Symmetry: D2
Subunit: 396 residues, 4 copies
């Protein structure tokens, strides 16, 4: 059998028995290029929280999870590179490797796996209805294209809390930093101290950044970031962000900025911080990024948000002070991360002890039975990254 | 003496006697690195029209003009590369060549020539108060860094209507196309059929584009674009832009898109087209650019527009459907063109007859006395690029 | 049945009855991801001439041909994107789409299709033993990754002489130009006026180059290059190449250079040009490329050349004046073209009439029975690109 | 007065009284855009050792030194950005900031400071005859373009052993790594464990490399590289380099390779390593770099080497196995480092404690009187980077 985390509506999730995976696409067409995995580790993301909070078009009954690490237990006949028993990291993007986007390495926007729009992902709104992987077992299509084979079992399993971050958050923070132009000696501001913002800060550090400033309103997440060796900015203070940056750096701007918040952003200041203001991060990043800088935006912005602040925000239309970014010659880089572009190199960085990602993001391993409470604690703001071990493969 | 085009407020300009240029900066500090030019050709830009329409903070008394081609008649002692008599193209950006931005080739955002913000330009709001060049004579500072020496007099003067476009519009259209990722075989949509949109289309063609579609509401400019060999889209029709693109290409999207309109954009449709809606072009480009595409934005967006449609638009804040561009993984590239990055190669393209820019943009040479009427005709929408010859150097 | 061109050693080729293609790799392992094509057009390359001249370790009995355009007449069970009857362009590289090289777009060096080294190709020495396609029928593996679907039958077949260049020579010329940094306004020197050098020149022109100088010692090919609109340099003259360039450009260097000759290069000068001197082109490109320039090298250099001038050259070791290139800060870009990187955009350039590649390279369509005489005429230096139409599909 | 290190021919150098610097170029033409520095730190380079060994056309009497850090004590009338007392890092390249190369950031090949060829440098053969700076005082031309202002006196002087590496070796190591494609998770091989190879290794580590293998035949330098945290390969062993790499990585190739040796390279193996063989490193890097990799070559190769192994090598012509590199699709990146491209970011990496460059390269501070013994110890292979403090400014 199988069981997984199901969205029930009204901010609730629950573990339920679900169908065992089949070798077919979501439209029921049998495939020979996929594998069925026994899930080793499967995480909870901020994107899942957006869905569970009712800020997307997600429907009741949705099986969640797009951050999978697992063992191949079955394979189709068009799977040349994986053997039964192999341990693999699964990119959250469902990609075919047989379309223009995939061939050009734009694996976040594959043209064939989703009938409604480009781009596919597991257990995710508007992403092709590929079943989620916060579960015991899951299907991965186009296995020879998507999967990253991990090192022999023993090496890999010792670092499983780090390697479970390769499915999404480490490559996502990395993509945010790279597309914001971070490199050796850069000064960087990362808005957001959730797991993706922390991964972006760790990635900026791995890239050689001179200093990373991580901003948030949540004081537990700021304390965590500071303890991990980053500088911080507290957006709930009345002190403007540019003054908090100037106090740390000697100038009110950074070389590079990353938005790791997205469409549920809060305003700034004692009062501002209390209310949602979806364009706040974009507007602040134009203010604090130096001229000709690049703004990397891994934070999610959607086409429909039923709980947004106004009619315009309900269809993703925000009041952005674009003239400011224009006057400073800023570039803006957005979208789902093409995880496959970076996951192999990041695996090598983890295996050679060049990054301590599980420590930086606050990995906490929980059972599948503890997933609903993990969602609740994460929603409350704890500075953790919940990693489910469904079969008690490594946390007995 | 000297005379130039002076902004008088209330949509009026007039030629007036102005001071002869001095070898000093706008703060009165003497400089040895500049030259004084006798102006050979000096054009009128859409940016000037924004100022003359009262859509910026420009003050009465402003001498206009930032598109200069001229002859060196005086030089300071820190000018090693120019000789009296040399014919030069002047980039519209005032850049020092002695700051981080300039050294990194971000010459549109020089850090030292403007006390108020990065970036300088002649006769332009918020750009360092460097005197404009729609005039008989003008100072160019940091001459060894900024100026592009043109071919020996005779060769260059035969193509002066083409070469006068190197100060701004050809490099600007080019920057729009390059930053939108145009190359050999690309399909391109250019919003705007004014001189910059036409230069972007010509630049896309020079870059090897398979096809360029130029959109506008002005039927004279669309007829011009069509006669120049481009495809067109008429935004005043009720037929949606994506359907007009699909009728030409077989799909409702292009590979690359350029915004050559900016902050006075009109809405689309029979009724829409009649009223201003500043976020219209940005929103439409996210709709018609394919996933993972790049949107190049040479069109001007400002920090303050006194005549905007609403309070938010008066400080450059627009209602942009950013969630759409995010869902499609779009990148956005903005700002003043770094003219020096591209003007030498574009000069070679002009001299070797690889681009016919004066024909494409509708160059029309006028006297300095005819500048106010040139402004009026340009404002009315004629499909021309007005080029003043102040001393009757080549149009007797 | 099937027939194809077979290499017989001692400079001879002959059309022979060969086996009908099978759905298997070169080792006999069955594959269900390939297609069998009915060959529509299939060309003869300069690489085939190196093999036929005995300048490689190609073995007697080799079926030649790696420039195929064809119609899908049989597909494996796991092919998702091709239908029977589709017309397709086949990149000359045999690539899997399932390894690190392919995922990173380095499809000229696929890691799994060739047991001996990275990189695969049809009918080619050290390329994995994939059967050549100067034949009636041919297998293409991993069809959903390699094949480029051509437009609706009719439009496509009208331009088949141009579209047949997409399998190799147009993307190759293009790769040489792009990796040499060619763009709008560039000055370019292309060494070699065979079909690949002519395609490099046409590609440089499509990229916007101001002027392309094509060098060769073969008068017919130089006259052809002139007729097609390029400048020329005749290496059989005693006039040094840099003087020839200076007479055309006013300076003895170009911005970009492309080696479209490879390891059978001749020396320069009246006497020099009569004798092989394999480092001649590499050495000359360092002399005529401007400082900080890039030298794109599509011309083939091999690890073993049994007929080379000396012991070192038989092992691919050449006396290259590297200190000159180093002193000028040159970069060198080499290898088999990754055809899939550029073929789709180049297809759109052909279909929209932006490049007349068949005319530029001198396409001459012939039957399969005329292939051996075509090889002979090509070996003698005719300025033609031989395109075989094996079933007389379009050349009746 | 002034004193500096003078090359006397026959492998000797001596400190002599030399002229005080003058505000003029090497031709005697007065300039008002330069500064005269009081030298704070000034290092000895492997390039100086090539000259002192008689392996270049350097002439007897040359004042050596191109690695200067100093205090502005006199400025020309046209210097805008430096004040008396400023502490500055001097890039080793003499660049004008006013030519095509400088504007495009190719400051290693400036077109105007050297009459004989592009590119200038202090105290260096074929570099324009700009006076060397292993001395008490030195002129720097075009000060507003070349100089990098260091942080407030106190912070800066505490880290002077690290900051003295910004003039050449840290940016050089960095350039070699970046142009070899090094980034987060890369595997890297650096040929050469002198100060530049050690700086390349430190730069690769700062860029995020998973592991760096440093090769040399000199045991002291290998032991140093190990102590500093890198992996090593000993080329004096009979064990082939690819086997040494395979023992460390599990595969006989690296993602990226850097040649930090240049034209006095030794062969490999117990016997081989005792003899000069100048193409050894180039040939070995093609063997150990993975397909489609990039080979960064900061190691010097010259147009004339009077002491080379053979006639061809005396003219910079080497028997390089180019067919191997071609077969593997390698690119080769060469030339003098454009120090200004990277020095400011590397300064911030030093100031924020992200790189411990002085420790890694083995900085040993000495007096000007000890320079000749420093040259001798360095020539004998000590694992040190000699930094002269001519006025005992920080090393009392
Ligand atoms: N692009 C991709 O591929 C991708 C992949 C993963 C997650 N995401 C998106 O990344 C974003 C972050 O994910 P997460 O897991 O870290 O989510 P999260 O909800 O745990 O973290 C967001 C953080 O932003 C903070 N925040 C709110 N307003 C702020 C403001 N004005 N300034 C600074 N911080 C502010 C919150 O307090 C919170 O700590 C989400 O939008 C998620 O959907 C994108
Ligand atoms: N970035 C730079 O360096 C730079 C340089 C030059 C000019 N500019 C800016 O470029 C823009 C164009 O300059 P120009 O000289 O061509 O100006 P212009 O005013 O002559 O042309 C703008 C055109 O846009 C059209 N337009 C309005 N709404 C439209 C819509 N929704 N879709 C399509 N077209 C629409 C107008 O009808 C008009 O023809 C201006 O904003 C100008 O300030 C920028
Ligand atoms: N990298 C790739 O993917 C790739 C693809 C196709 C072909 N190739 C190689 O491209 C090269 C050109 O292919 P082709 O079909 O045009 O070959 P070709 O043999 O028909 O043309 C080579 C031309 O070089 C000329 N030549 C010889 N010495 C010269 C010199 N010193 N200077 C200038 N010209 C000189 C010859 O006279 C000849 O016309 C060959 O080496 C071929 O193997 C590489
Ligand atoms: N491109 C630039 O801007 C630039 C700047 C500085 C120095 N350089 C050049 O960089 C090179 C290194 O400079 P350095 O100061 O470290 O010099 P160095 O002479 O102190 O070091 C070179 C090292 O290479 C070793 N070596 C010799 N043969 C070898 C082989 N086959 N494999 C590995 N190691 C081998 C030597 O034993 C020596 O330790 C020199 O050629 C120098 O001229 C270039
Ligand atoms: Zn996620
Ligand atoms: Zn796909
Ligand atoms: Zn303008
Ligand atoms: Zn500047
Ligand atoms: Zn070929
Ligand atoms: Zn492959
Ligand atoms: Zn040096
Ligand atoms: Zn220069």
């Amino acid at each position: 059998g199988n069981r997984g985390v199901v969205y029930l509506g009204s901010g609730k999730v629950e573990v339920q028995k679900i169908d065992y995976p089949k070798m077919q696409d979501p439209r029921g067409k049998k495939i020979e290029h996929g594998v069925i995995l026994k899930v080793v580790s499967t995480n909870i993301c901020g994107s899942d929280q957006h869905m569970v909070r009712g800020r997307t078009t997600a429907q009741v009954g949705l099986v969640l999870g797009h951050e999978i690490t697992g063992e191949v237990i079955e394979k189709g006949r068009d799977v040349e590179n994986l053997q039964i028993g192999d341990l693999v990291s699964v990119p959250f993007n469902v990609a075919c490797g047989r379309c223009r986007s995939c061939k050009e390495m734009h694996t976040g926007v594959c043209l064939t796996v989703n009938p409604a729009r480009a781009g596919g992902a597991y257990g995710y709104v508007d992403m092709g209805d590929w079943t989620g992987g916060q579960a015991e077992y899951v299907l991965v299509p186009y296995a020879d294209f998507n999967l990253l084979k991990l090192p022999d079992r023993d090496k890999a399993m010792e670092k499983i809390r780090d390697l479970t971050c390769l499915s999404d958050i480490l490559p996502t923070g990395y993509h945010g930093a790279v597309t914001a132009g971070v490199g050796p000696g850069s000064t960087v501001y990362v808005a957001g101290a959730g797991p993706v913002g922390l991964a972006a800060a760790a990635s900026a550090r791995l890239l050689g950044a001179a200093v990373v400033i991580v901003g948030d309103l949540n004081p537990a997440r700021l304390a965590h970031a500071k303890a991990q060796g980053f500088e911080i900015a507290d957006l709930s203070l009345d002190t403007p962000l540019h003054e908090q940056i100037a106090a740390l750096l000697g100038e009110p701007e950074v070389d590079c900025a990353v938005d790791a918040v997205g469409f549920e952003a809060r305003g700034h200041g004692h009062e501002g911080a209390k209310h949602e203001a979806p364009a706040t991060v974009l507007n602040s990043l134009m203010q604090v990024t130096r001229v000709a800088g690049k703004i990397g935006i891994p934070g999610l912005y959607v086409t429909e948000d039923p709980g947004a602040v106004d009619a315009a925000a309900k269809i993703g239309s925000l009041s952005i002070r674009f003239g400011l970014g224009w006057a400073k010659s800023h570039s803006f880089h957005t979208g789902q991360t093409p995880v496959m572009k970076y996951n192999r190199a990041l695996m090598q960085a983890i295996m050679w002890d060049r990054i301590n990602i599980a420590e930086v993001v606050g990995v906490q391993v929980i059972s599948l039975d503890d997933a609903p409470r993990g969602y609740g604690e994460f929603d409350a703001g704890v500075p953790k990254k919940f990693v489910i071990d469904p079969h008690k493969t490594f946390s007995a």
